[PDB]
Amino acid sequence: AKVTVLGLGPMGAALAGAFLAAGHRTTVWNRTGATEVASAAEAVAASPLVVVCLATYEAVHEVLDPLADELAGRTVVNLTSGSPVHARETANWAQQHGAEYLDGVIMTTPSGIGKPDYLLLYSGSQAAFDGSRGTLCALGEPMNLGTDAAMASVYDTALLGLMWGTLTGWLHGVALMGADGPGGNVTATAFTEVANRWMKTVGVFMNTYAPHVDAGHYPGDEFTLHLHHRTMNILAHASELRGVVSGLPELLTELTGRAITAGHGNDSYARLVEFIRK
Template sequence: MTEYDVTVLGLGQMGSALAAALLRAGHRTAVWNRTPAKTAALTAEGAHAAATASEAQAGSPVVIACVLDYPALHEILDPAALAGRTLVNLTSGSPEQARETAQWAAGHGIDYLDGGIMITPPGIGNPESMLLYSGSRTAFAAAEQLLAAFGEAIHLGEDPGVASLYDTALLGMMWSTMTGWLHAAALVTADGATAAEFTPLALRWLGDVNGFIRAYVPQVDQRAYPGFDATIDVQLATIEHLVHASQVRGVDAALPELLRDYAARAVAQGHGGDGWARVIELLRKAA
């Protein structure tokens, strides 16, 4: 029996934010969580708290799941209740887990869409927040109006693994960038500056880095890396300064040493005259 527009399974920090956004957008929303107490704030806003996960899944044409991980997801999914419905899985996982779950869903007559949420819970509901989806186009069409309550819904294609792949890749980029800033902050604060003094320059610098990345895009796709701006030879010498400055200040040098290793390997392979984008060949060959 379908009584609601949408069901949310999992009311942790993210699932609660998703359900609250759906309610704010005026959708009739059913919710379920393993620990029932977490439904209280949402029922006060008009949500229906289903007694069981199966009842929740049978209650709406579109079921959105957001739990800790895939083992938890598979514990709560009820294929009999979900058959003929659209399942939108916003639980984080690997592309392989997404593809396996899409296959599992197809085997049970469930239309499956996978998703990656590129924002923390307070950003849910901001139209500028980015949420990535991939998988069945009919599932995306069925859920699109509901998903608009969360932020911008970007469908990346039919392969259900792509949203997770992009999500994971973007998070990797976030950790690298944030750790680069933290390393830089450790360096300058060691000599008495504050992060508040340094960071405006760091953020301005990120704008320039943005430009470098744009210039390297065709190089990466064409696998040709002319050193038109700064060669790896020159950058290797400069990275040595970063390693030295770190060591002298007692700042951990593992990060610049890793960068030095990439640069040195590219030089050893005869590519010192290329630009930094050449490093992708070392990354690609690591597997």
């Protein structure tokens, strides 16, 4: 399959190599076995699928706006990182000039491209995703978020916050396990061996609590917010004894405490969405 990569930076060059490794006829172009052309006009003309990874959405428009007429009948997969509004604006512009627009985000570094274990998230034209999915598989596992092009930007930000939340609880537990004391002086590798098994149950919690959020009904069942707050105060006590100062226990008891004061102690953790949202 013919595919054009616009932008051969660290990530861009990784994407072009993934297409070549997967047996695609690849044309490349950079602002600074692949067939490199000297102009973006030539690159766009060489393929019906044009993948874009530029530094900013401003760079995307500076390169693509002069090519407004050349893009009719083509598919534009824009993996550039940017805001939800810029993804929507580029989607509308592409729709104006007759191009199928898929906005995407790469959920790994340049060295993760080509490996099918890393995710790339796309949102926008469904005909583009379905028609291009086999080619996009060269870069990693493709997921279709839906029809709104701006979804990929929001998802990346929301998934990074989930990652940092996980990693901050992990680092807190690592220091907790490493501190001197009875049952302490455990290495981070030993703790993480158990932690990664435990993450299967944490994933079950998230799967259990998402319908709670959507329904506005948060049955506490066997793990009420009373018990969360109860055990969070033990974590804060243990952390103060073992010298672990991460700010997490203060965030958690204050959040649950506000929900308890509101009278929702008999609810599940998902009720706490009402206390971080507007």
